[PDB]
Amino acid sequence: RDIAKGHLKKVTEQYPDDVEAWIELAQILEQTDIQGALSAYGTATRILQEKVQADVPPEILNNVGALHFRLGNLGEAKKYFLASLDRAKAEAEHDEHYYNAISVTTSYNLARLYEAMCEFHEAEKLYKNILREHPNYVDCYLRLGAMARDKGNFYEASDWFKEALQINQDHPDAWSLIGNLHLAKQEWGPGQKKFERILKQPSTQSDTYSMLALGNVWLQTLHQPTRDREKEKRHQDRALAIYKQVLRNDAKNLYAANGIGAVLAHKGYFREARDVFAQVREATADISDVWLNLAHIYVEQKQYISAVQMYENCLRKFYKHQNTEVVLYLARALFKCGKLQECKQTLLKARHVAPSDTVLMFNVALVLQRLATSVLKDEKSNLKEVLNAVKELELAHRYFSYLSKVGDKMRFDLALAATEARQCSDLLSQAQYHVARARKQDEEERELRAKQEQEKELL
Amino acid sequence: AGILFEDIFDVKDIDPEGKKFDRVSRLHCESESFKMDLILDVNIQIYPVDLGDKFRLVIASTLYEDGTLDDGEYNPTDDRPSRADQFEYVMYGKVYRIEGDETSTEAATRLSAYVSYGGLLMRLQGDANNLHGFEVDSRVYLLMKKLAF
Amino acid sequence: VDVTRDIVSRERVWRTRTTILQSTGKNFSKNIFAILQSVKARE
Amino acid sequence: YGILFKQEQAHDDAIWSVAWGTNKKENSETVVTGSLDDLVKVWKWRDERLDLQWSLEGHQLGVVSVDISHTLPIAASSSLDAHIRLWDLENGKQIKSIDAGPVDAWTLAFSPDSQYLATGTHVGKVNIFGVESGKKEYSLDTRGKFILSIAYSPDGKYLASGAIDGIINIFDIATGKLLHTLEGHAMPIRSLTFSPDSQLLVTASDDGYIKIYDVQHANLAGTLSGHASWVLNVAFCPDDTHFVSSSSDKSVKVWDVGTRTCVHTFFDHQDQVWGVKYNGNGSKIVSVGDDQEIHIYDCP
């Protein structure tokens, strides 16, 4: 490609009646900066009208619209695709160049755009129009399942993906999608190894995708209290061997280092996890995983100032606003004034979208107790706050009574709520003691204002 | 540690009011994460820079990893580790004014560190959260490295 | 049918699964495996 | 088709719901909103301007739902504090506080007759409390996961319920029995409302599809592609010609109930919109959200 780029740089300056030179310019720049190809197509579109009045072939407008499809010019790319379809239809005599395939690919990109233009009805209609004329096509039949998969992972998605594999078992995308199906329900933890080892035959090798899927499904087995049984250490060693193997054959793969940092963090090296995650962050930090793995290291070293922002940034994406896992990772060792009262605000924001989780209903009570003990033990503070603390403690006690009746828990029984009840009892006693102090401060302020008013009367 | 600030930036405009001198130019850069302004002045002659280039600016109070708080003097004969080994442009200055949007009642929310590297100025304007390590009359460094990306 | 070979032979796939895995830059394992072995030697 | 009023910093904390009147009983001119700052602000939309009339407090936790009674100028507000407090827009005082303990308190549902108040229960049932009684009159025995949305029909003939797994439960408020169970969604239903004629039923699930079903024969009338994010709030125009849809992507699309086409979209909100509601005539469309700014959208 370097010699071709140099040759195009030579043909660009001079003007020996160049007609197709810009086409070759753009044909290489599609992998590189996407604006160079757009500039080349922009000039190539107008250079095809001086020699004769010849309409632009649909293949160039189709490729420029494809370039714009990845960009924010979705409507402009839509116009490009529609005009390409109109032009390709006019090719009644270009049976050798197969205008039909040009229309097929243009409509494929157009349906991909409509699926991306918040219009899945038109995307379904267009992909089905491709199906009705060419059932031997895979990508349309695979995107239709993705569309039905948004509503749920048990609808026609899980059926179309397997029918697509049954028609082409040597298609890595379809088989990987098959493995992707089992990821919604992780009950197939150990058993997904078999279905991920179907296309691990040497003919398909090497395939980094499936090997990293194995590494991920093997990492999921971690975070268990059975590590002392020499079981999770072997799992760490196996996943580390997988990551080393995919590192030797591919040193630039970021996920291998991601998993290596994950395991090293699991090994107790957080001081040494930042260095390994640094290369992954510097390569491309716009992946949802790194913002959290790094925020875990920051929140581990008593740096919530550098961890709350990382959790906020991961939520800046247009997919949700109040996720449960992010807020769960948000409150780890928060004890400061701006990290308890506000922590309640974010906890309520999280519980608003799905209150059925027990961990939220337990953490809200724990933070309520923390504030109450933080205002009813060593304070001697404002009075209205002593009035509000008893209400907060009563709500916490009601939630203590309610949480005990729930059957399932966070893979750990909550029978240890008794100490919380005793804590709240002595908090109630201390509150009934400190309300008298509140009244004493009330009479103090009253006599202070009186002894100031007398001086003002003197003046 | 001594890392008073750490963030990636990108060049977006050079000498908007016309290049006055011949070896120094204004770099009206912007951040990518903390969203902070930057008016750094680098020696364009020895360290050329064009628009769109990104660099890892790291204001550090010292050049040593252990952070021994050097007195401040040119001592090239030194075998101790130095943080400058992984930076292509380092400077040494002394912040002289920390302006902010303070009021009579509520604390400030956005500060503005004014540091002079012996004549080369730099305004690190932004929020008042990450500028806690800047105090008037204190020595600081720059430690910037251009990113190849 | 010919419609299959008619499209797969003229198209261009600039990005696929594996492309997403490697960084667009040059980050070798020399600066990675060094620490990966150093951590193992201390244990 | 644009924006008339722009209330900047309408609240200290994010607004999660908005209530505006439709009748002439001193409700269409007053806007009641409930936010997470424990401020039940009674805004009076007088002189075509959003002016504050009352500022009601007392809720321990943030307001989850606000609605105005159809045949009555009083209002009520619920929260997750299990203390559903009734209020009055005639005096800015509290009528009562239904202690829907211990945690069993969700969005409100004013009856069209303004005599019953439906509230979701964590056990999966739908408790129907009395407005002037406060005691649990009768509970619908349709268990499951949880009730995420409850809506009363304008003329009081049906009642639907949004579950956590896309389960519409068509009840009968005339007899208190489950008639149909529409399960055309697998996503948690956020909110829903009845058509002004009680013939169409829009469902705001978390799939981005506005699947408008029918209530008379419990069938789907057509799948409409909504936004890309989750549709939070949805309301019908009082004249029954269009319906707005609030999503989680800073987008206020006004979809057509007849042609299933977006007739206009607003992008004036910097954050996600949480509440959308019409005026008494359907021209002004009030909106709230995490931006904490009340926008009044005029569509003449």
TrEMBL record, chain B:
Belongs to the eukaryotic RPB8 RNA polymerase subunit family. It comes from Sus scrofa. It is found in: Nucleus. The keyword Nucleus applies. InterPro entries: NA-bd_OB-fold, RPABC3. Its main location: nucleus. One of its GO terms (biological process) is DNA-templated transcription. This is DNA-directed RNA polymerases I, II, and III subunit RPABC3. GO terms for molecular function: DNA-directed RNA polymerase activity. SUPFAM superfamilies: Nucleic acid-binding proteins (SSF50249). PANTHER family: DNA-DIRECTED RNA POLYMERASES I, II, AND III SUBUNIT RPABC3.
